[PDB]
């Protein structure tokens, strides 16, 4: 096998302004999917190798959390970094998070979450598959999620605080083995739209639909980069391109959904495929899938009932058919 080490700062964890459990990060670990901070270059070699080999593994995984504030200056928030073994959305609570492998961190303190291969091993004798075009379950691998609990307060003024709380650093070492010739996957899009208006549609037995304004950076990036939505029975045709969507904003709390998937959006991240034709006017529309495998298998989330928040969306191009 061939190895590749990499250490990078991923971004920052902000203050908790809602007093509820807030999601602040969802870090994909798959080598062709793993994400840099803007103008970061540490993971380029990892993506490159991920496109050249058919199987990958992690030898170790450290997430270092560096406080951006002093512990006596800011109070009332606990940070919880945890391992999502399969990169699968779930309906969890703070307590559920605590049932995962995880580390809690007090505001104003530093800490490092360290994981062993035992914790990170794939189903192929410890290995995972690299090619995100062809499978999810044996391919996607683990994720690091970060949440927070408790309204972040300035201790001097006993007021709401709103700055960054932690620097987030990831250190790992990917190993690769077996061959592939997939330059398809070297250019996957990873981006963010801070100005996206969003809505959800559906009726009993129909797919959950996500509408996004047709002029938005998100929308006009997805159309350009997705293949053409010509794939199929009593459903629309979808693009074969899957996107992971991550909504870290508290404004994601104002998104209503038809039953029974309000939990999935409330959870902050899910998968989508561009669907053909128009659904809401002036919008581009997507089917929503509660797992990556469901997206690849065209098994969309189906509503059971019926019933324009501008939010911010981190999105990741999952594949390149
Ligand atoms: Cl909760
Ligand atoms: Cl809870």
Author numbering: 80 to 311, 314 to 388, 397 to 410
Question: Any passages from the paper?
Answer:
An expression construct composed of HAstV-1 CP residues 80 to 429 produced a soluble protein and remained stable at high concentrations in buffers containing at least 1 M sodium chloride and 5% glycerol. The HAstV-1 CP core exhibited an apparent molecular mass of ∼20 kDa as examined by gel filtration chromatography, consistent with it being a compact monomeric protein in solution. We therefore generated a selenomethionine-substituted sample and used single-wavelength anomalous dispersion methods to determine the 2.6-Å-resolution structure of the HAstV-1 CP core. Two molecules in the asymmetric unit differ by a root mean square deviation (RMSD) of 1.0 Å, as assessed by the DaliLite server, with notable differences observed in the β4-β5, β10-β11, and α4-β15 loops that we predict are involved in intermolecular contacts in HAstV particle formation (see below). Our final HAstV-1 CP core model contains amino acid residues 80 to 411, with a disordered loop at residues 390 to 396 being the only loop not visualized in at least one of the two molecules in the asymmetric unit. Interestingly, another unexpected disulfide bond was observed in the HAstV-1 CP core, linking strands β1 and β12, despite the presence of reducing agents throughout purification, and this disulfide is conserved throughout serotypes HAstV-1 to -8. Notably, the disulfide bond observed in the HAstV-1 CP core lies on the inner surface and may stabilize the nearby basic residues Arg84, Lys136, and Lys138.
HAstV particles display T=3 icosahedral symmetry formed by 180 copies of the capsid protein (CP), which undergoes proteolytic maturation to generate infectious HAstV particles. The AstV CP is composed of several domains, including a highly basic N-terminal domain, a core domain, a spike domain, and a C-terminal acidic domain. To further explore the structural features of the AstV CP, we determined the crystal structures of the HAstV-1 CP core and spike domains to 2.60-Å and 0.95-Å resolutions, respectively.
